[PDB]
Amino acid sequence: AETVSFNFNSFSEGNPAINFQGDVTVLSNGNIQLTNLNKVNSVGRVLYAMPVRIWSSATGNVASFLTSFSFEMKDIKDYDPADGIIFFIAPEDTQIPAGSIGGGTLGVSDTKGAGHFVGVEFDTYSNSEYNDPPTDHVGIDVNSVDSVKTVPWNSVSGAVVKVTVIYDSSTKTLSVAVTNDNGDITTIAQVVDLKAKLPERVKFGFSASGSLGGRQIHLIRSWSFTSTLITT
């Protein structure tokens, strides 16, 4: 099999294994801060530099993967805690959409919420323009921030949140488990065919954004990942 695995206990902005896009900044404690606090419509994205072959057009096999990460979102005075973080998967040439409005597009889609990526959002602001649930929520997005499926959640300012993700290739099921700060766990699962939605080679990463009047601290603290593709 073809296995790809890495693990970041802390990041740095001079590492060739990480692509930075937008307002991304690495702090002295090793955390990655995706948005710029005093910047209007800020957008920041981080991507594992190396593309991962998630499927083969030769065999027809699709990879299974397991990945976990921890983030922190914190309020800043006089600003609406918005807009959220999104763990996404996209073609290897992915870029911040041209003329991005940041805000509720999460840095992955255009104005009407479309784009080419599959992902899991931790949305903290309800945009009715994207059919947002009326509360903080966790959602499964397939080429659009108009979530295929959402689950009410609760973002607690200043808390370290841990996430564990499993995609089983045979059932093509993507399931998510969020351990909150009060101990409670939140899960959400959805069947997504990666082969049909994405190309053979892709890039995984995180993206956060905000608007004018809607901003908050978006930090990524750690990240480990392992994918395995059977070559037979």
| Site residues, Ca ion (CB under 5 A) | 104, 123, 125, 127, 132
- Footprint of a second copy (CB under 8 A): 1-7, 9-10, 12-17, 25, 27-31, 33, 37, 49-53, 56, 58, 64-66, 72, 74, 151, 157-158, 160, 164, 166-171, 173, 175-177, 179, 182-190, 201, 217, 219, 221-222, 226-228, 231-232
Quickly list H helices, the chain.
194-197
Q: How far is the CB of 127 from Mn ion (least distance, A)?
A: 7
Residue 201 touches which of a second copy, Mn ion, Ca ion, none (CB < 5 to 8 A by kind)?
A: a second copy
- Alpha carbon separation from 131 to 43, 102, 125, 157, 222 (Å, rounded): 21, 17, 11, 24, 31
The answer for 226, left when phi > 0, alpha when psi is -120 to 50, beta otherwise, is beta
Q: Is 147 in the site for Mn ion (CB under 5 A)?
A: yes
Cα separation, 216 vs 209, whole angstroms: 9
Q: How many CA atoms lie within 13 A of 191 on its CB side?
A: 3
Nearer to a second copy, 105 or 217 (CB): 217
Cα separation, 158 vs 81, whole angstroms: 12
Binding residue positions for Ca(2+): 123, 125, 127, 132
Q: Binding residues for Mn ion, per CB under 5 A?
A: 123, 132, 139, 147
